Design a binder for this molecule. Structure first.
Ligand SMILES: NC(=O)c1ccc[n+]([C@@H]2O[C@H](COP(=O)([O-])OP(=O)(O)OC[C@H]3O[C@@H](n4cnc5c(N)ncnc54)[C@H](O)[C@@H]3O)[C@@H](O)[C@H]2O)c1
Ligand SMILES: NC(=O)c1ccc[n+]([C@@H]2O[C@H](COP(=O)([O-])OP(=O)(O)OC[C@H]3O[C@@H](n4cnc5c(N)ncnc54)[C@H](O)[C@@H]3O)[C@@H](O)[C@H]2O)c1
Ligand SMILES: Cc1cn([C@H]2C[C@H](O)[C@@H](COP(=O)(O)OP(=O)(O)O)O2)c(=O)[nH]c1=O
Ligand SMILES: Cc1cn([C@H]2C[C@H](O)[C@@H](COP(=O)(O)OP(=O)(O)O)O2)c(=O)[nH]c1=O
Lengths: 361, 361
């Protein structure tokens, strides 16, 4: 099967591309604009494959995207291209509205026209897989807000949308467009909403990779508020396996939440990374001494937790890593890939760090 | 109070403006792009008031909208500007993405910057009222799908978003942006979602005005599918009263569904109109003879029904008209306002009619 993937040069996208080329017989055409988050180095291990092709393009460029669809004749689409950082969306929402909402709209129109003109066979089997986030569901009650006996709620596929940030509002909106295109035009769409991802090739602006790199560089490890906020951590390679399973076996019109049921408090994750580094790269003092509390994120969602029961019983997907095994693999990966890390740390990255962290709130 | 209203030259917007000038002590600055749906003739009753000012502008024009906010120094905003026709959104979705989503974003940013620079007093009392639709909730179970005994569900403020069309997806997206701006920046926003409106100054592309006018012009009365689909009808003047009540007494961060609990089947509404015309403007044959069953709307939502319990018990709002009283007033209004009709109908209107109805599906 020929799969057209947008955002394949990103964190999760590159994992999807590497997985497809290494463990399947499908082919891939990767469309990526190469923003600050795009990195062809993350695809170095498969870029030479005859089953892989790269197209440097913007999903908003309708004419070019249209041409690419006609050239490669994809059997399915996996849409991961997006602006993904909540903190960047707070100070610069425009890029999120543009890429996440308008860009998904532009891609949907190209896909709709393409799909509509396909032969009976190919048309019935075509699939448009929209990759999304658990953040569209809003925030969940926190353990410190309920009785120490009551069972905390989880995000299910029927949980009402209630996005808190420009980023999550942008993704929620994109999800709606995908479903409306399905209901109105019949386009065979599938939507997945996954918990936080972590692992190899993660851009150093998200919690885990930022903490790992800052720790090694002797810099502060910024904790928003009290660090008691909760996130559900899924290893990126596990997400990638789930995504290929969904695009291949998922049912059109369905939604599948993806997660490994691994709720963790931010501070706990940071301590875990620090202890791992104290063990692997010991120095005079503990990396813990770099933990630093800083002003909280405006509108911060205090708890995300995904119920992946549906995808488990319907597709049989199960994560292979545990947070313990995954976080160690992640720390080990960054220590073994200083080449990749040094390249992704440009003056642009430093400017973002100064913008979001120095003189912070 | 100075109220900045967007889309005040439209159907509901003009009713809001007329209500404010005629029945309150508040002032108004109307911003409208004057698309096919914006007609200054709908505001003839109050265009000369010293308490009314009109600004011909596009909400997407940030520079101009900013200048307007600074000049008039509004105490509140009532955002009604939008592309509102589901059928137009099916064949031309771009305008909906642009105006409903990106336009709302653009307006939210101008309002945020304005609100943030306000003095303590004016800043605490400021309100950004987003006018929306019940269509964001998706479709509801239809009477012919459930036991003739079970109680049919209604749309409540906690009903999950599930937009079916490009139009409703566009509005659902705008709603999310408004709530996200509140959660992230603190902007004091309010969102209302109302059922279908009908009454004076309704553009002739929606069911009721189209049927009334086509009947009087000896043209077909186009029924999508079997006409067994259900809509909840609220007289436009009742909506206007509710809206001013909300912007004035509504609580920041709250959502209020608006409706009069008047579920009706499309075919029944058409028969009611035909009976009224057979009575008021009798001819050789019944107007019913012009009814024609045409291809159904793609993705057609079969039933909308709003539960207005919350706004009723919290703000004390109640509709003054019944569907019986309102529909008769509507028919009488069109019979007496041929001048307005002829001024709003144009060459573009006939192009839309041919596009959507002739050789239809
Ligand atoms: N990172 C997470 O924990 C997480 C969790 C749930 C869902 N998601 C979703 O998964 C997808 C991928 O996330 P990610 O973390 O890998 O993002 P990322 O920031 O690592 O990468 C984004 C990628 O998209 C590309 N891109 C951006 N705008 C583009 C445009 N206009 N045209 C083409 N390419 C464009 C970038 O160049 C980059 O390669 C997104 O849709 C995101 O919302 C991410
Ligand atoms: N008509 C209904 O039954 C109904 C029901 C529920 C909610 N709503 C909502 O109520 C609001 C008004 O609905 P309506 O029926 O009166 O619409 P309408 O079609 O009658 O009028 C839309 C108005 O917005 C203006 N407009 C469009 N794009 C603009 C832009 N970019 N900048 C400035 N002005 C622009 C038009 O010129 C026009 O005056 C909308 O937000 C709509 O979604 C309508
Ligand atoms: C980037 C960052 C995040 N966080 C917190 C905020 C979130 O609760 C959690 C993960 O943030 P992040 O990686 O930005 O992911 P997301 O916002 O999608 O969940 O870590 C910090 O405490 N400090 C930081 O420097
Ligand atoms: C415009 C139109 C609508 N309808 C139906 C579709 C809807 O069920 C109902 C009202 O349609 P419409 O006025 O377009 O409003 P909305 O889509 O917001 O509810 O009337 C017809 O049967 N024929 C027509 O020509």
């Amino acid at each position: 099967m020929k799969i057209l993937i947008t955002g394949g040069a990103g964190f999760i996208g590159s994992a999807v591309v590497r997985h497809i080329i290494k463990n399947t017989q499908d082919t891939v055409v990767n469309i990526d604009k190469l923003t600050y988050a795009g990195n062809l180095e993350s695809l170095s291990d498969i870029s030479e494959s005859n089953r892989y092709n790269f197209e440097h393009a913007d999903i908003c460029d309708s004419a070019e995207i249209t041409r690419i669809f006609e050239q490669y004749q994809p059997d399915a689409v996996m849409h991961l291209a997006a602006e993904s950082h909540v903190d960047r969306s707070i100070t610069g929402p425009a890029a999120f509205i543009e890429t996440n909402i308008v860009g998904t709209y532009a891609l949907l129109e190209v896909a709709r026209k393409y799909w509509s003109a396909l032969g009976e066979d190919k048309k019935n089997n075509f699939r448009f897989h929209h990759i999304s986030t658990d953040e569209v569901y809003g925030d969940l009650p926190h353990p410190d807000e309920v009785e120490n006996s009551v069972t905390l709620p989880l995000f299910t596929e029927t949980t009402a949308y209630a996005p808190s940030s420009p980023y999550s509002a942008s993704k929620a909106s994109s999800d709606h467009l995908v479903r409306a295109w399905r209901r109105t035009y019949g386009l065979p769409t599938i939507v997945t909403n996954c918990s936080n991802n972590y692992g190899p090739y993660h851009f150093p602006e998200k919690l885990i990779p930022l903490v790992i790199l800052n720790a090694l560089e002797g810099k502060p490890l910024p904790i928003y508020g009290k660090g008691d906020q909760i996130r559900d951590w899924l290893y990126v390679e596990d997400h990638a396996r789930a995504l290929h399973m969904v695009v291949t076996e998922g049912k059109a019109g369905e939604t599948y939440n993806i997660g490994g049921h691994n709720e963790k408090k931010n501070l706990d994750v940071v301590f875990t990374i620090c202890d791992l580094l104290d063990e692997i790269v010991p120095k005079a003092t503990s990396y813990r001494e770099q933990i630093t509390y800083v002003a909280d994120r405006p509108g911060h969602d205090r708890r995300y937790a995904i119920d992946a029961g549906k995808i488990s019983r319907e597709l049989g997907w199960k994560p292979l890593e545990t947070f313990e095994s995954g976080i160690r693999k992640t720390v080990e990966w960054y220590l073994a890939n200083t080449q990749w890390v040094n390249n992704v740390k440009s003056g642009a990255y430093q400017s973002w760090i100064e913008q979001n962290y120095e003189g912070r709130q």
